Amino acid sequence: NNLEEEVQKLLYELSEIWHQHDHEASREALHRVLEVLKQLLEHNNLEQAVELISIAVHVAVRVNNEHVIRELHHLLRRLLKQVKEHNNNKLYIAVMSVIMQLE
């Protein structure tokens, strides 16, 4: 399945950036993930958006990319709205935990 495979690759890329403190790789990877998150939200792929935004938050905080942090605040706003409208209690708590880690 092309979408799951690609999300899994994006998660791996960001995970390796986080473990290696790879500041050089991070800016390109974070901008890409920001665009993927917006698509995922548009197509109501909320499970995958939650797993990707969590590792995106970890990386953005670790490398202190203040622009991406600001963008992630907005995407978290939208994601929380969308998980609440779909009444998904497990996703709600996951998004809250990410919000608490970004803050």
Side-chain angles (χ1 to χ4, degrees):
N1 184 248
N2 287 316
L3 184 51
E4 310 134 35
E5 277 173 22
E6 181 64 12
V7 158
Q8 291 300 136
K9 293 177 179 178
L10 286 166
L11 293 167
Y12 169 77
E13 175 167 29
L14 285 175
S15 171
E16 153 172 20
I17 290 179
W18 188 84
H19 285 276
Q20 307 179 0
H21 301 260
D22 185 358
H23 285 52
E24 190 146 47
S26 66
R27 180 168 191 280
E28 196 277 344
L30 286 167
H31 279 73
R32 197 158 58 259
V33 172
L34 287 173
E35 289 275 278
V36 174
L37 287 167
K38 290 190 253 242
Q39 296 293 326
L40 288 170
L41 284 173
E42 289 188 25
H43 300 69
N44 315 92
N45 293 119
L46 302 187
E47 184 125 356
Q48 277 149 330
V50 173
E51 35 185 2
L52 192 66
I53 205 161
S54 170
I55 191 55
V57 158
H58 291 322
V59 169
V61 170
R62 176 152 279 190
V63 301
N64 197 44
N65 182 332
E66 296 169 320
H67 175 66
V68 171
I69 287 163
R70 282 188 290 276
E71 293 298 293
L72 287 172
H73 290 291
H74 184 53
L75 284 169
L76 278 170
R77 206 153 163 51
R78 297 187 49 204
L79 185 59
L80 183 66
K81 183 166 172 73
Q82 291 191 40
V83 298
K84 288 167 46 173
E85 288 181 341
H86 293 40
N87 291 303
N88 183 323
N89 63 34
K90 267 167 136 233
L91 283 199
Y92 174 78
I93 285 316
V95 168
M96 294 308 306
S97 163
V98 179
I99 287 168
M100 288 194 204
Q101 299 158 46
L102 188 52
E103 308 222 19

PDB file of all heavy atoms in Angstrom, residues 70-92:
ATOM      1  N   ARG A  70       6.137  26.834  14.891  1.00  0.00           N
ATOM      2  CA  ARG A  70       4.942  27.647  14.679  1.00  0.00           C
ATOM      3  C   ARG A  70       3.973  26.954  13.718  1.00  0.00           C
ATOM      4  O   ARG A  70       2.759  26.918  13.954  1.00  0.00           O
ATOM      5  CB  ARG A  70       5.360  29.030  14.192  1.00  0.00           C
ATOM      6  CG  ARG A  70       5.855  29.920  15.309  1.00  0.00           C
ATOM      7  CD  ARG A  70       6.081  31.361  14.817  1.00  0.00           C
ATOM      8  NE  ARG A  70       7.238  31.443  13.915  1.00  0.00           N
ATOM      9  CZ  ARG A  70       8.491  31.568  14.338  1.00  0.00           C
ATOM     10  NH1 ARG A  70       8.779  31.583  15.628  1.00  0.00           N
ATOM     11  NH2 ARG A  70       9.479  31.705  13.448  1.00  0.00           N
ATOM     12  N   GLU A  71       4.481  26.408  12.612  1.00  0.00           N
ATOM     13  CA  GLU A  71       3.601  25.682  11.701  1.00  0.00           C
ATOM     14  C   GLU A  71       2.965  24.457  12.371  1.00  0.00           C
ATOM     15  O   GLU A  71       1.794  24.144  12.117  1.00  0.00           O
ATOM     16  CB  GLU A  71       4.387  25.270  10.454  1.00  0.00           C
ATOM     17  CG  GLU A  71       4.789  26.488   9.661  1.00  0.00           C
ATOM     18  CD  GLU A  71       3.568  27.234   9.180  1.00  0.00           C
ATOM     19  OE1 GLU A  71       2.844  26.652   8.328  1.00  0.00           O
ATOM     20  OE2 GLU A  71       3.301  28.361   9.649  1.00  0.00           O
ATOM     21  N   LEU A  72       3.716  23.765  13.218  1.00  0.00           N
ATOM     22  CA  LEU A  72       3.175  22.579  13.898  1.00  0.00           C
ATOM     23  C   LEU A  72       2.090  22.976  14.912  1.00  0.00           C
ATOM     24  O   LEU A  72       1.087  22.266  15.085  1.00  0.00           O
ATOM     25  CB  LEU A  72       4.325  21.832  14.569  1.00  0.00           C
ATOM     26  CG  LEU A  72       5.228  21.087  13.564  1.00  0.00           C
ATOM     27  CD1 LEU A  72       6.428  20.569  14.315  1.00  0.00           C
ATOM     28  CD2 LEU A  72       4.449  19.913  12.984  1.00  0.00           C
ATOM     29  N   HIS A  73       2.250  24.114  15.584  1.00  0.00           N
ATOM     30  CA  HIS A  73       1.145  24.603  16.417  1.00  0.00           C
ATOM     31  C   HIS A  73      -0.148  24.734  15.625  1.00  0.00           C
ATOM     32  O   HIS A  73      -1.218  24.311  16.086  1.00  0.00           O
ATOM     33  CB  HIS A  73       1.463  25.938  17.099  1.00  0.00           C
ATOM     34  CG  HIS A  73       2.491  25.848  18.188  1.00  0.00           C
ATOM     35  ND1 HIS A  73       2.230  25.203  19.383  1.00  0.00           N
ATOM     36  CD2 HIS A  73       3.695  26.454  18.350  1.00  0.00           C
ATOM     37  CE1 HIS A  73       3.272  25.325  20.190  1.00  0.00           C
ATOM     38  NE2 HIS A  73       4.174  26.086  19.593  1.00  0.00           N
ATOM     39  N   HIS A  74      -0.078  25.319  14.425  1.00  0.00           N
ATOM     40  CA  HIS A  74      -1.307  25.446  13.646  1.00  0.00           C
ATOM     41  C   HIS A  74      -1.820  24.085  13.212  1.00  0.00           C
ATOM     42  O   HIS A  74      -3.037  23.862  13.191  1.00  0.00           O
ATOM     43  CB  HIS A  74      -1.115  26.334  12.418  1.00  0.00           C
ATOM     44  CG  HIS A  74      -2.381  26.563  11.646  1.00  0.00           C
ATOM     45  ND1 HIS A  74      -3.545  27.024  12.233  1.00  0.00           N
ATOM     46  CD2 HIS A  74      -2.688  26.318  10.347  1.00  0.00           C
ATOM     47  CE1 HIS A  74      -4.497  27.098  11.317  1.00  0.00           C
ATOM     48  NE2 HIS A  74      -4.002  26.679  10.162  1.00  0.00           N
ATOM     49  N   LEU A  75      -0.923  23.182  12.775  1.00  0.00           N
ATOM     50  CA  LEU A  75      -1.429  21.892  12.304  1.00  0.00           C
ATOM     51  C   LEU A  75      -2.038  21.098  13.447  1.00  0.00           C
ATOM     52  O   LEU A  75      -3.011  20.366  13.232  1.00  0.00           O
ATOM     53  CB  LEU A  75      -0.335  21.080  11.621  1.00  0.00           C
ATOM     54  CG  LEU A  75       0.014  21.560  10.206  1.00  0.00           C
ATOM     55  CD1 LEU A  75       1.284  20.885   9.700  1.00  0.00           C
ATOM     56  CD2 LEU A  75      -1.113  21.260   9.226  1.00  0.00           C
ATOM     57  N   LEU A  76      -1.479  21.237  14.657  1.00  0.00           N
ATOM     58  CA  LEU A  76      -2.032  20.575  15.846  1.00  0.00           C
ATOM     59  C   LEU A  76      -3.412  21.127  16.193  1.00  0.00           C
ATOM     60  O   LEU A  76      -4.304  20.375  16.610  1.00  0.00           O
ATOM     61  CB  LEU A  76      -1.074  20.765  17.018  1.00  0.00           C
ATOM     62  CG  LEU A  76       0.083  19.772  17.005  1.00  0.00           C
ATOM     63  CD1 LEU A  76       1.134  20.146  18.033  1.00  0.00           C
ATOM     64  CD2 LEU A  76      -0.362  18.276  17.212  1.00  0.00           C
ATOM     65  N   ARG A  77      -3.594  22.448  16.045  1.00  0.00           N
ATOM     66  CA  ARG A  77      -4.911  23.067  16.186  1.00  0.00           C
ATOM     67  C   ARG A  77      -5.942  22.417  15.277  1.00  0.00           C
ATOM     68  O   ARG A  77      -7.064  22.114  15.700  1.00  0.00           O
ATOM     69  CB  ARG A  77      -4.812  24.563  15.837  1.00  0.00           C
ATOM     70  CG  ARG A  77      -5.816  25.422  16.478  1.00  0.00           C
ATOM     71  CD  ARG A  77      -5.290  26.859  16.629  1.00  0.00           C
ATOM     72  NE  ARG A  77      -6.379  27.787  16.890  1.00  0.00           N
ATOM     73  CZ  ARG A  77      -7.308  27.647  17.829  1.00  0.00           C
ATOM     74  NH1 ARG A  77      -7.216  26.715  18.764  1.00  0.00           N
ATOM     75  NH2 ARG A  77      -8.342  28.486  17.847  1.00  0.00           N
ATOM     76  N   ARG A  78      -5.605  22.306  13.982  1.00  0.00           N
ATOM     77  CA  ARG A  78      -6.494  21.691  13.004  1.00  0.00           C
ATOM     78  C   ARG A  78      -6.732  20.219  13.316  1.00  0.00           C
ATOM     79  O   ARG A  78      -7.868  19.734  13.240  1.00  0.00           O
ATOM     80  CB  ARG A  78      -5.875  21.826  11.613  1.00  0.00           C
ATOM     81  CG  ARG A  78      -5.709  23.245  11.162  1.00  0.00           C
ATOM     82  CD  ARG A  78      -5.256  23.338   9.706  1.00  0.00           C
ATOM     83  NE  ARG A  78      -5.995  22.538   8.741  1.00  0.00           N
ATOM     84  CZ  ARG A  78      -5.482  22.147   7.579  1.00  0.00           C
ATOM     85  NH1 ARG A  78      -4.244  22.458   7.234  1.00  0.00           N
ATOM     86  NH2 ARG A  78      -6.230  21.431   6.744  1.00  0.00           N
ATOM     87  N   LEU A  79      -5.668  19.495  13.666  1.00  0.00           N
ATOM     88  CA  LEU A  79      -5.798  18.070  13.946  1.00  0.00           C
ATOM     89  C   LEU A  79      -6.678  17.820  15.157  1.00  0.00           C
ATOM     90  O   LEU A  79      -7.525  16.914  15.146  1.00  0.00           O
ATOM     91  CB  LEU A  79      -4.417  17.469  14.172  1.00  0.00           C
ATOM     92  CG  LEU A  79      -4.358  15.953  14.357  1.00  0.00           C
ATOM     93  CD1 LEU A  79      -4.916  15.218  13.149  1.00  0.00           C
ATOM     94  CD2 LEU A  79      -2.901  15.628  14.585  1.00  0.00           C
ATOM     95  N   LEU A  80      -6.480  18.599  16.229  1.00  0.00           N
ATOM     96  CA  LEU A  80      -7.326  18.428  17.404  1.00  0.00           C
ATOM     97  C   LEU A  80      -8.793  18.667  17.058  1.00  0.00           C
ATOM     98  O   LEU A  80      -9.666  17.868  17.425  1.00  0.00           O
ATOM     99  CB  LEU A  80      -6.865  19.355  18.524  1.00  0.00           C
ATOM    100  CG  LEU A  80      -7.633  19.223  19.833  1.00  0.00           C
ATOM    101  CD1 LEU A  80      -7.365  17.824  20.427  1.00  0.00           C
ATOM    102  CD2 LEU A  80      -7.202  20.314  20.769  1.00  0.00           C
ATOM    103  N   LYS A  81      -9.083  19.758  16.340  1.00  0.00           N
ATOM    104  CA  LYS A  81     -10.431  19.998  15.825  1.00  0.00           C
ATOM    105  C   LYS A  81     -10.991  18.771  15.107  1.00  0.00           C
ATOM    106  O   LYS A  81     -12.142  18.373  15.339  1.00  0.00           O
ATOM    107  CB  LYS A  81     -10.418  21.197  14.872  1.00  0.00           C
ATOM    108  CG  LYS A  81     -11.788  21.595  14.320  1.00  0.00           C
ATOM    109  CD  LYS A  81     -11.756  22.976  13.655  1.00  0.00           C
ATOM    110  CE  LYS A  81     -13.064  23.286  12.932  1.00  0.00           C
ATOM    111  NZ  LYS A  81     -14.229  23.592  13.818  1.00  0.00           N
ATOM    112  N   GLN A  82     -10.192  18.168  14.214  1.00  0.00           N
ATOM    113  CA  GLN A  82     -10.710  17.101  13.352  1.00  0.00           C
ATOM    114  C   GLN A  82     -10.870  15.796  14.133  1.00  0.00           C
ATOM    115  O   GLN A  82     -11.832  15.051  13.911  1.00  0.00           O
ATOM    116  CB  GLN A  82      -9.797  16.915  12.128  1.00  0.00           C
ATOM    117  CG  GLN A  82      -9.873  18.111  11.178  1.00  0.00           C
ATOM    118  CD  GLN A  82      -9.211  17.943   9.795  1.00  0.00           C
ATOM    119  OE1 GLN A  82      -9.293  16.882   9.145  1.00  0.00           O
ATOM    120  NE2 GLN A  82      -8.531  19.012   9.347  1.00  0.00           N
ATOM    121  N   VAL A  83      -9.973  15.514  15.085  1.00  0.00           N
ATOM    122  CA  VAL A  83     -10.180  14.300  15.872  1.00  0.00           C
ATOM    123  C   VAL A  83     -11.385  14.473  16.790  1.00  0.00           C
ATOM    124  O   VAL A  83     -12.137  13.515  17.025  1.00  0.00           O
ATOM    125  CB  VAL A  83      -8.911  13.890  16.657  1.00  0.00           C
ATOM    126  CG1 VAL A  83      -7.776  13.572  15.685  1.00  0.00           C
ATOM    127  CG2 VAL A  83      -8.503  14.918  17.649  1.00  0.00           C
ATOM    128  N   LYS A  84     -11.634  15.693  17.292  1.00  0.00           N
ATOM    129  CA  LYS A  84     -12.795  15.868  18.158  1.00  0.00           C
ATOM    130  C   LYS A  84     -14.090  15.732  17.366  1.00  0.00           C
ATOM    131  O   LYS A  84     -15.063  15.150  17.860  1.00  0.00           O
ATOM    132  CB  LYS A  84     -12.736  17.208  18.914  1.00  0.00           C
ATOM    133  CG  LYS A  84     -11.663  17.225  20.016  1.00  0.00           C
ATOM    134  CD  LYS A  84     -11.345  18.622  20.586  1.00  0.00           C
ATOM    135  CE  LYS A  84     -12.590  19.387  20.894  1.00  0.00           C
ATOM    136  NZ  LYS A  84     -12.256  20.670  21.609  1.00  0.00           N
ATOM    137  N   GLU A  85     -14.112  16.222  16.120  1.00  0.00           N
ATOM    138  CA  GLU A  85     -15.318  16.097  15.303  1.00  0.00           C
ATOM    139  C   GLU A  85     -15.609  14.651  14.935  1.00  0.00           C
ATOM    140  O   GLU A  85     -16.774  14.299  14.724  1.00  0.00           O
ATOM    141  CB  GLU A  85     -15.197  16.949  14.038  1.00  0.00           C
ATOM    142  CG  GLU A  85     -15.295  18.453  14.297  1.00  0.00           C
ATOM    143  CD  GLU A  85     -15.191  19.293  13.028  1.00  0.00           C
ATOM    144  OE1 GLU A  85     -14.683  18.772  12.005  1.00  0.00           O
ATOM    145  OE2 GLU A  85     -15.631  20.469  13.053  1.00  0.00           O
ATOM    146  N   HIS A  86     -14.585  13.803  14.853  1.00  0.00           N
ATOM    147  CA  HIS A  86     -14.799  12.379  14.598  1.00  0.00           C
ATOM    148  C   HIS A  86     -14.912  11.555  15.881  1.00  0.00           C
ATOM    149  O   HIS A  86     -15.040  10.323  15.800  1.00  0.00           O
ATOM    150  CB  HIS A  86     -13.688  11.822  13.695  1.00  0.00           C
ATOM    151  CG  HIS A  86     -13.708  12.377  12.304  1.00  0.00           C
ATOM    152  ND1 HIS A  86     -13.979  13.702  12.029  1.00  0.00           N
ATOM    153  CD2 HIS A  86     -13.548  11.769  11.104  1.00  0.00           C
ATOM    154  CE1 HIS A  86     -13.956  13.891  10.720  1.00  0.00           C
ATOM    155  NE2 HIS A  86     -13.705  12.733  10.135  1.00  0.00           N
ATOM    156  N   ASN A  87     -14.889  12.210  17.049  1.00  0.00           N
ATOM    157  CA  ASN A  87     -15.191  11.579  18.337  1.00  0.00           C
ATOM    158  C   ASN A  87     -14.270  10.400  18.607  1.00  0.00           C
ATOM    159  O   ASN A  87     -14.692   9.372  19.144  1.00  0.00           O
ATOM    160  CB  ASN A  87     -16.646  11.127  18.395  1.00  0.00           C
ATOM    161  CG  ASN A  87     -17.592  12.279  18.429  1.00  0.00           C
ATOM    162  OD1 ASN A  87     -17.508  13.124  19.311  1.00  0.00           O
ATOM    163  ND2 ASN A  87     -18.483  12.346  17.444  1.00  0.00           N
ATOM    164  N   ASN A  88     -13.005  10.535  18.227  1.00  0.00           N
ATOM    165  CA  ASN A  88     -12.069   9.422  18.334  1.00  0.00           C
ATOM    166  C   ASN A  88     -11.309   9.616  19.639  1.00  0.00           C
ATOM    167  O   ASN A  88     -10.336  10.365  19.681  1.00  0.00           O
ATOM    168  CB  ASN A  88     -11.112   9.421  17.153  1.00  0.00           C
ATOM    169  CG  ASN A  88     -10.169   8.240  17.166  1.00  0.00           C
ATOM    170  OD1 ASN A  88      -9.690   7.776  18.217  1.00  0.00           O
ATOM    171  ND2 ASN A  88      -9.860   7.751  15.955  1.00  0.00           N
ATOM    172  N   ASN A  89     -11.717   8.920  20.706  1.00  0.00           N
ATOM    173  CA  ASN A  89     -11.126   9.237  22.005  1.00  0.00           C
ATOM    174  C   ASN A  89      -9.653   8.838  22.083  1.00  0.00           C
ATOM    175  O   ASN A  89      -8.861   9.546  22.721  1.00  0.00           O
ATOM    176  CB  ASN A  89     -11.955   8.618  23.143  1.00  0.00           C
ATOM    177  CG  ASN A  89     -11.986   7.098  23.109  1.00  0.00           C
ATOM    178  OD1 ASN A  89     -11.011   6.445  22.716  1.00  0.00           O
ATOM    179  ND2 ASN A  89     -13.106   6.518  23.566  1.00  0.00           N
ATOM    180  N   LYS A  90      -9.248   7.734  21.440  1.00  0.00           N
ATOM    181  CA  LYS A  90      -7.828   7.378  21.488  1.00  0.00           C
ATOM    182  C   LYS A  90      -6.965   8.387  20.733  1.00  0.00           C
ATOM    183  O   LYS A  90      -5.874   8.747  21.198  1.00  0.00           O
ATOM    184  CB  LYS A  90      -7.580   5.964  20.969  1.00  0.00           C
ATOM    185  CG  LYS A  90      -7.590   4.928  22.089  1.00  0.00           C
ATOM    186  CD  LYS A  90      -7.668   3.514  21.575  1.00  0.00           C
ATOM    187  CE  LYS A  90      -6.685   2.636  22.342  1.00  0.00           C
ATOM    188  NZ  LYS A  90      -5.763   1.866  21.440  1.00  0.00           N
ATOM    189  N   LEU A  91      -7.428   8.866  19.570  1.00  0.00           N
ATOM    190  CA  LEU A  91      -6.653   9.876  18.858  1.00  0.00           C
ATOM    191  C   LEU A  91      -6.621  11.185  19.630  1.00  0.00           C
ATOM    192  O   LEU A  91      -5.610  11.897  19.601  1.00  0.00           O
ATOM    193  CB  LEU A  91      -7.215  10.114  17.455  1.00  0.00           C
ATOM    194  CG  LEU A  91      -6.888   9.075  16.392  1.00  0.00           C
ATOM    195  CD1 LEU A  91      -7.098   9.669  14.990  1.00  0.00           C
ATOM    196  CD2 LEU A  91      -5.454   8.562  16.583  1.00  0.00           C
ATOM    197  N   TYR A  92      -7.731  11.541  20.288  1.00  0.00           N
ATOM    198  CA  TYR A  92      -7.765  12.761  21.090  1.00  0.00           C
ATOM    199  C   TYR A  92      -6.633  12.783  22.102  1.00  0.00           C
ATOM    200  O   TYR A  92      -5.919  13.785  22.230  1.00  0.00           O
ATOM    201  CB  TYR A  92      -9.106  12.883  21.812  1.00  0.00           C
ATOM    202  CG  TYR A  92      -9.173  14.045  22.792  1.00  0.00           C
ATOM    203  CD1 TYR A  92      -9.370  15.362  22.349  1.00  0.00           C
ATOM    204  CD2 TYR A  92      -9.035  13.824  24.169  1.00  0.00           C
ATOM    205  CE1 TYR A  92      -9.432  16.420  23.245  1.00  0.00           C
ATOM    206  CE2 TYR A  92      -9.083  14.901  25.088  1.00  0.00           C
ATOM    207  CZ  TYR A  92      -9.288  16.184  24.616  1.00  0.00           C
ATOM    208  OH  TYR A  92      -9.339  17.236  25.507  1.00  0.00           O
TER     209      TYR A  92
END
